[PDB]
Amino acid sequence: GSISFHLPVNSRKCLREEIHKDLLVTGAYEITDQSGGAGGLRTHLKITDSAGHILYAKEDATKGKFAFTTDMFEVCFESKGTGRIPDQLVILDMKHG
């Protein structure tokens, strides 16, 4: 799977997956910010199961990879900043084994 989306400042967008099978899930993401971190802009990535256990987390996420096994989970991106900042562009690619 592949998703591209804009992430406004101080907002959160999540992808929720409910596949009732045991899986190896791998992913790669890139968060792009034209402003160079204006207004203290930062983005956190958090992957959680349906009971809120953290399967993966990255504070101050930029570009990277993740992996975890399961069975329902959510991949969330959340930015924090002050002032008027253009939306960030985020790409997320995942595959399921």
Swiss-Prot record:
Tissue spec: Ubiquitous.
Taxonomic superkingdom: Eukaryota
Region (Required for interaction with STX17): 3-97
Localization annotation: Endoplasmic reticulum membrane; Endoplasmic reticulum-Golgi intermediate compartment membrane; Golgi apparatus membrane; Golgi apparatus, cis-Golgi network membrane
Lumenal-facing ranges: 3-97
Its biological purpose: Cargo receptor involved in protein vesicular trafficking and quality control in the endoplasmic reticulum (ER) and Golgi. The p24 protein family is a group of transmembrane proteins that bind coat protein complex I/COPI and coat protein complex II/COPII involved in vesicular trafficking between the membranes. Acts at the lumenal side for incorporation of secretory cargo molecules into transport vesicles and involved in vesicle coat formation at the cytoplasmic side.
Additional facts recorded: Ectopic expression of TMED10 alone does not result in its proper cis-Golgi network localization. Interaction of TMED10 with TMED2 is both necessary and sufficient for transport of the couple to the cis-Golgi network, and TMED3 and/or TMED9 contribute to facilitating the process.
Domain notes for this protein: The GOLD domain is required for proper p24 heterooligomeric complex formation and efficient transport of GPI-anchored proteins.
Subunit details: Predominantly dimeric and to a lesser extent monomeric in the ER. Monomer and dimer in ERGIC and cis-Golgi network. Forms homooligomer (via GOLD domain); the assembly is promoted by direct binding with leaderless cargos and may form a protein channel that facilitates cargo entry into the ERGIC. Forms heterooligomeric complexes with other members of the p24 family such as TMED2, TMED7 and TMED9.
Family as reported in the entry's similarity comment: Belongs to the EMP24/GP25L family.
Descriptive protein name: Transmembrane emp24 domain-containing protein 10
Portion of the full sequence shown: 32 to 129 of 219
